[PDB]
């Protein structure tokens, strides 16, 4: 998840 | 196939309509041409190619790739395609029924290994025999330009329209393409799940609607549901041999440069 910033914020909006 | 079942199965179709800005019923009334007498217009070499980026000068200049040879160009252009697909893909994840609800770093994992199985399935909707669609149906970019490009260029999307013509052979529709690609995201032997149990019950929820699915809306085709599992195989297959392509890519071609989303996925993924 720290690897995949844009892919987690994608997931969290 | 009860109502609750037919149920998930609309559920999972509208979901699929919502998020993704191209599906295969418009995608097939373009390449049909027998809804309009203006077709998409046709890149099938260097000049109809350059034509083309006359529209797509700011995407171009944007990051300024404007005057970079003609095959990053080409591919510049198909990663920002990928981007858009791999963002859609995200929001139908989130309304699959119980996907929202799983560990976010497991949410991660099932995209990072899902996500190309699933753009190279829905890319067999806008592929035909001589090329694909491209911008929302509006272009037609050839096989035989695109065999044309330069090693390693040139072998980047010939084995995805092997795949494709097979995989249209099975005359799929959304309803049933929107299951599959629920099927190919909840997928429980992703490397490095942490809830490889609660997801496989997801698995196996999904994967029941789609094999009932496919006997009511296929009857005839009666082995339809054991060809869809053989193509995951073999999406599976297509995205190892593609990743490493795209692996040769970055170690070969000093000026293309790939898009950071599409980084996070490939990194450490094969
Ligand atoms: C709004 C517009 C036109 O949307 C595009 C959507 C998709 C593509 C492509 O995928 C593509 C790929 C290769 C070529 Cl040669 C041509 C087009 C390009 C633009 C843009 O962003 O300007
Ligand atoms: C399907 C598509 C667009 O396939 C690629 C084709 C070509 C490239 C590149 O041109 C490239 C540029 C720089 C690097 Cl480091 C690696 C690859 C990337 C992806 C994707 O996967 O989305």
Redesign the interface.
Known sequence: ?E??????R???E | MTADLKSLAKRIYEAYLKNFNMNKVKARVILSGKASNNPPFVIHDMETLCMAEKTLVAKLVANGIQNKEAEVRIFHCCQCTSVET??EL?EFA?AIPGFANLD??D??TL??YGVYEAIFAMLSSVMNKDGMLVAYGNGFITREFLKSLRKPFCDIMEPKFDFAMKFNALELDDSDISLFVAAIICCGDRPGLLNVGHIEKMQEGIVHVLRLHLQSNHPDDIFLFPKLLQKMADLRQLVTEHAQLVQIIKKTESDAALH??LQ??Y??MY
């Open positions: 998840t690897r995949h910033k844009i892919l987690h994608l997931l969290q | 791999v963002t995200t989130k976010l770093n949410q991660v995209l990072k950071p989303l996070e996925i990194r450490d």
